[PDB]
Amino acid sequence: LAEALHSAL
């Protein structure tokens, strides 16, 4: 989930 958010951002 952390990395999903990194990509999203």
CA-based max dimension of the chain: 12
Q: What is the DSSP letter of 6?
A: H
| Residue 5 Cα to chain centre, angstroms | 2
Alpha carbons within 13 A on the beta-carbon side of 5:
2
Q: What is the DSSP letter of 7?
A: H
Q: Which amino acid is at 7?
A: S
For residue 7, give both structure tokens: 């990509």
Obtained via which technique?
A: X-ray
